[PDB]
Design a protein around this ligand. Structure first.
Ligand SMILES: OC[C@@H]1O[C@@H](OC[C@@H]2O[C@@H](O)[C@H](O)[C@H]2O)[C@H](O)[C@H]1O
Length: 353
């Protein structure tokens, strides 16, 4: 791999509906290949789908290889995809099964349904596996009951899906929860992970990375007034050595040594590079810079430059090559953006950390 800046993965046609693209996610397969997807706002009919683009040259070039269509509901695979190569067998699904979770939503935004698709051929073909969780109207307004934003993580022969939940609307504006499965087909009950006692609080957008000492770093945006007249979405994290037990961990506000106060739509990864504990690397949806921590989340975070533009839920990935040396930074644009595109940069962590 090499450093790359602002490589275009996909530039949408003008006749796509603003924002055209949004919500980048990616995966690196064990052979090193990179896959990228996003919310793809094509005119309907036919129903929207999640495109799957591949790079076999470490991000220099990209080609579409498949599309994940809404074969289960016919509504459209519309919001909040997530790619995940199983690192171990789960039930009848071998290590290396490639999963996509994402939300099936009709054009009228009347419902949400986080569904799970699987590919056994590295993303060439897909089959529906199960519904994870379904809810109400796909708008982020209090009183509504949607589900949103799946994040997948396997541990001990199980798959965990973390997501944002508005269904407990009598008590919370939004929470974050998870469900667990040992077979990809049958899901256990909803477990509340992050709840707050002020109704107008809206924690959201969970992303997890495992640290080398066995702790899990669970990052989220914490929407709140914090007792003022102004709402904000500062980044918070929780630390737990049990990835199914988040509720018992107190939230910790991410503090940056420069004074930047990062907000919205976090992403977190970990590399062995940078020191004896490696480095946690965090993005927000508002800042173009990155935030790093060489002490497992202790102390304050260091803001560093980044050549990739800022974007909503900008996605990070530490590539495996050279023991975690290169970082993918992948944007699909901004909310309601008039000129969104899907792009990627690669940074050399040997130099930038
Ligand atoms: O991904 C498309 C995007 O989702 C909807 O917002 C959901 C909202 O986003 C986070 O801030 C919260 O966790 C969740 O409630 C938008 O309407 C749509 O553009």
């Amino acid at each position: 791999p090499t450093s790359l800046t602002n490589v275009t993965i996909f530039s949408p046609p003008s006749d796509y509906i603003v924002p055209r693209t949004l919500y980048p996610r990616n995966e690196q397969l064990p052979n090193g290949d990179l896959l990228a997807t996003w919310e793809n706002y094509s005119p309907e009919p036919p129903a929207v789908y999640f495109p799957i683009y591949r790079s076999k040259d470490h991000g220099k070039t990209w080609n579409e290889i498949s599309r994940v269509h809404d074969t289960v509901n016919g509504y459209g695979l519309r919001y909040q995809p997530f790619l995940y190569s199983l690192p171990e067998r789960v039930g009848s699904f071998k290590k290396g099964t490639l999963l996509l979770a994402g939300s099936s939503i009709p054009t009228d935004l009347s419902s949400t349904d986080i569904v799970l698709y699987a590919s056994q051929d590295d993303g060439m073909t897909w089959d529906f596996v199960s519904h994870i969780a379904a809810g109400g109207e796909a708008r982020p307004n209090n009183g509504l009951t949607p589900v949103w934003e799946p994040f997948l993580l396997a541990n001990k022969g199980k798959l965990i899906c973390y997501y944002s939940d508005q269904r407990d609307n009598a008590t919370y504006g939004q929470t974050m929860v998870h469900q667990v499965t040992n077979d990809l087909k049958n899901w256990g009950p909803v477990v509340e992970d992050v709840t707050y006692p002020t109704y107008t609080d809206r924690p959201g957008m969970p992303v997890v990375t495992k640290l080398p000492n066995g702790q899990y770093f669970y990052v989220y945006e914490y929407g709140s007034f914090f007792g003022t007249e102004t709402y904000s979405f500062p980044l918070y994290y929780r630390l737990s050595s049990d990835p199914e037990n988040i509720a018992s961990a107190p939230g910790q506000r991410l503090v940056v040594s420069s004074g930047t106060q990062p907000t919205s739509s976090p992403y977190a990864v970990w590399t062995p590079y940078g020191g004896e504990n490696g480095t946690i690397i965090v993005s927000s949806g508002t800042q173009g810079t990155l935030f790093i921590n060489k002490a497992l989340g202790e102390g304050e975070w260091t803001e560093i430059p980044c050549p990739e533009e800022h974007g909503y839920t900008r996605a990070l990935r530490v590539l495996s090559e050279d023991g975690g040396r290169y970082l993918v930074v992948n944007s699909a644009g901004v909310l309601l953006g008039e000129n969104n595109r899907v792009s990627v940069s690669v940074m050399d962590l040997k130099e930038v950390l």
